């Protein structure tokens, strides 16, 4: 039970935590880059859209940029962030 904390790769064990400010689950990280949990992964991890954290394994990652100031991630226009699919460990 040792977790990655940045530069996340497929196969990494990660801690998925609730981020109230961004109203989403994210990967716990020491980097300022946000790694949001992809909404598709919530059922697999027995989470809902609360459990404060769960351990998971990264399955897929996609790099995104906010094109609108009003967005589901509550990030500024132009923010680059990741969406990560994960499964329970």
């Amino acid at each position: 039970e040792k977790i990655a904390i940045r530069d996340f790769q497929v196969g990494d064990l990660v801690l998925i935590i609730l981020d109230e400010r961004h109203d989403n689950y994210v990967l716990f990280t020491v980097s300022p880059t946000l790694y949001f949990l992809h909404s598709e992964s919530l059922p697999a991890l027995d989470l809902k859209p609360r459990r404060p954290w769960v351990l998971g394994k990264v399955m897929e990652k996609e790099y995104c940029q906010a094109k609108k100031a009003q967005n589901r991630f509550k990030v500024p226009l132009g923010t680059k962030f990741y969406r990560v699919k994960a499964v329970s460990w």
């Binding site: 790099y63 995104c64 940029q65 906010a66 094109k67 609108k68 009003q70 967005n71 589901r72 991630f73």
Partner: peptide
């Protein structure tokens, strides 16, 4: 259209 893959 809120975000796009880069």
């Amino acid at each position: 259209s809120e975000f796009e893959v880069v």
